[PDB]
Amino acid sequence: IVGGYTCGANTVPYQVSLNSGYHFCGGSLINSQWVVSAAHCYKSGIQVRLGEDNINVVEGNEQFISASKSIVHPSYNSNTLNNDIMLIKLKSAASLNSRVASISLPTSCASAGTQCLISGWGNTKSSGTSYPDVLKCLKAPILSDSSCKSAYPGQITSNMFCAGYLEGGKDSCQGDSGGPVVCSGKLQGIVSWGSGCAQKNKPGVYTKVCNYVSWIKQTIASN
Numbered sequence: 001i002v003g004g005y006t007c008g009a010n011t012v013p014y015q016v017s018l019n020s021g022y023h024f025c026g027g028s029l030i031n032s033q034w035v036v037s038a039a040h041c042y043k044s045g046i047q048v049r050l051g052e053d054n055i056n057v058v059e060g061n062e063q064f065i066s067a068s069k070s071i072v073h074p075s076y077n078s079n080t081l082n083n084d085i086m087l088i089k090l091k092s093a094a095s096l097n098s099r100v101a102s103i104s105l106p107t108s109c110a111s112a113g114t115q116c117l118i119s120g121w122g123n124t125k126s127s128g129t130s131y132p133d134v135l136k137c138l139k140a141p142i143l144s145d146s147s148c149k150s151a152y153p154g155q156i157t158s159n160m161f162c163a164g165y166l167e168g169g170k171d172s173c174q175g176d177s178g179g180p181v182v183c184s185g186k187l188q189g190i191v192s193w194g195s196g197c198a199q200k201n202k203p204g205v206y207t208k209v210c211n212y213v214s215w216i217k218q219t220i221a222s223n
């Protein structure tokens with residue numbers, strides 16, 4: 001997260017860290033045994049870490065659970081990143097409390113101007129790499145579809161939306177991929193891609209979760 005602030009320990013209880021010996025992506029807890037992340041964060045050997053704040057120190061509240069399976073959307077296209085969403089089922093259910101909690105799926109899509117909270121342990125520099133130990137937060141608005149398509153002509157599908165600041169300076173970045181974009185208490189986006197991080201007129205692009213709620217429900221119901 002570039003231009004963000006320190007969230008405060010466990011103030012984002014649905015945030016998870018995907019770990020394979022180091023933090024490589026974020027995710028969101030949607031029920032006690034399932035996490036939603038981005039399809040491009042897929043790899044084998046994933047351990048899901050819940051209740052984290054400092055990812056390099058065991059401070060208490062952490063729950064480390066291995067992924068039993070990861071389900072990449074069947075129509076995920078790695079070249080356009082269209083359908084960039086993945087579901088991870090945990091080997092055991094997590095103990096939910098006030099520090100580890102799930103986030104609700106939306107019943108409707110959010111509109112331009114909605115203010116959302118994006119969080120993660122990704123890079124904090126637009127020019128270079130500084131990776132934080134604690135969780136960073138950023139409040140950013142959803143942009144109109146015309147500004148998003150004007151910024152990335154021919155690359156935005158209906159399963160994507162832009163959020164951020166065209167002036168540059170505040171944005172999600174590498175390491176934040178797969179993490180949450182929460183607006184009014186509902187999970188509306190998943191950190192997916194962008195051109196560099198916090199560059200002027202190049203906002204972040206997010207997977208539009210309201211378009212996948214029936215797919216998530218049906219897939220969880222059959223697995």
Ligand SMILES: NC(=[NH2+])c1ccc2[nH]c(-c3ncccc3[O-])nc2c1
Nearest residue numbers: 172173174177192193194196197204
């Ligand atoms: N500017 C952004 N909002 C952004 C967000 C997530 C990203 N993830 C990546 C990324 N970069 C290199 C390898 C994997 C990634 O997910 N770039 C990213 C850029």
Ligand SMILES: [Ca+2]
Nearest residue numbers: 054055057058
């Ligand atoms: Ca920790």
Ligand SMILES: [Cl-]
Nearest residue numbers: 149153154155
């Ligand atoms: Cl277009």
